């Protein structure tokens, strides 16, 4: 027990009704942290993500990416005829996204390492945007901002890399492709622009690559990712 915030309000760092300020509990959940609360929830539902509601107890996992420092999931407890509020939000770090922004709007909430305005490319074309990652350990966000259709469902499904010989490339599940476990996924939408990404923490068994396709009207593009280790 080293990454648990326990708040005891019923009958491993244990907080109680003393850490509250005016019956409020602002909780900064580190990316590698867990929060287990023990109380009787007012409406038995909460968190205006991955949460587990079990009897008079609740557990919440910190999301890898946070868009606005104000976004937060709020629980209200009722112990001994008293109301206590717990605000939970992850530590605000403006992580960059290692991918290609194909969209043209510049007032986005997300920052991409590479970018390629698909609106400018020729019709009936297929231009590539490559993104590479080369670290021993990873703690990065890889995604894209496509103003139109995205192929396949990225990044839960991905497109195999190109074959030198005349062999077909298929759609695979990212978990199998990069061969790691707790891959976190995240989606977003700014008007018509779709923002699909995935997180990656830890090392990697074998240097592998994949592709995700973005089409808009008669124009098309594709982002090729490559991550390495060992």
């Amino acid at each position, epitope marked *: 027990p080293h990454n648990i915030l326990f708040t005891n309000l019923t009958n491993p760092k244990t907080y109680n009704e*003393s850490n509250f300020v005016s019956n409020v509990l*602002e909780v900064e959940l580190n990316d590698g942290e867990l929060f287990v609360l023990a109380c009787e929830l007012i409406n038995k539902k909460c968190f205006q993500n991955k949460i587990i509601y079990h009897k008079n107890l609740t557990i919440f996992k910190a999301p890898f990416y946070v868009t606005s420092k104000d976004v937060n999931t709020e629980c209200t407890c009722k112990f001994k005829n008293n109301n206590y509020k717990i605000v939970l939000k992850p530590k605000y770090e403006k992580k960059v996204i290692h991918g290609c922004n194909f969209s043209s709007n510049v007032s986005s909430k997300h920052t991409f390492t590479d970018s390629l305005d698909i609106s400018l490319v020729d019709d009936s074309a297929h231009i590539s945007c490559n993104v590479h990652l080369s670290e021993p350990k990873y703690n990065h966000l890889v995604g894209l901002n496509c103003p139109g259709d995205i192929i396949p469902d990225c990044f839960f499904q991905v497109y195999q890399p190109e074959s030198e010989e005349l062999e077909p490339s298929n759609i695979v599940y990212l978990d199998s492709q990069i061969n790691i476990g707790d891959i976190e996924y995240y989606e977003d939408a700014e008007g018509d622009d779709k923002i699909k990404l995935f997180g990656i923490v830890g090392s990697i068994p074998k240097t592998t690559s994949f592709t995700c396709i973005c089409k808009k009207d008669k124009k098309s593009a594709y982002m090729t990712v490559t991550i390495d280790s060992a």
Partner: antibody
Amino acid sequence: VMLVESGGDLVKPGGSLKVSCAASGFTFSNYAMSWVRQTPEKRLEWVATISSGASYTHYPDSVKGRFTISRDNAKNTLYLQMSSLRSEDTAMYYCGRQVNRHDRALDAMDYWGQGTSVTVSP
Amino acid sequence: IVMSQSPSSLAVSVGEKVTMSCKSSQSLFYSSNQKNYLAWYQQKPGQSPKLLIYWASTRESGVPDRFTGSGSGTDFTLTISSVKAEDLAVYYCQQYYSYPPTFGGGTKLEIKR
């Protein structure tokens, strides 16, 4: 513990000004910081409080919507943007570090900076 | 939470006993914790303030023993056993019970020449 703030200048009323605070001699990411100004009448007013990881902020009604606190945990600095300044905001602003021994968002202040003077005048 | 500090000015003599009052507008006592959310500060002339006492009587590491503050509920007092010629400063009172933390008026210590 090294708390050195800078950036105080004569600002015209309505204008803005961001002052910074340089933290050194402690684990910045583990202690929450606050700004407290001292009027020329030697009155102490709390300005803003920020959480260790800059996710939660606190401002009194006086400067709510006008001032904006911020911090760069990597650069070990504390920033305070002050917009739509008024003659009353003419004070000596101090960069203070809240006590972390007691695990609570609101607490007293362990150490205090030297102080940077603000003069909102036209 | 309005913090008052009577009197405004305090003419003191080197070594004599000194007491400062701090009346609060509301209770500052979490019953279960039995701790008062008040703190005392010393602002040396031409210097930034410095924390002396927190909770009710819990002084900070490095604060002299002569500074003995005590209070409960809304009444709070800072007592000095023997006034040194060094600690002649403006002493402030602050609450940190609920937002926003409010300060006191301050009791200046003057020398009785």
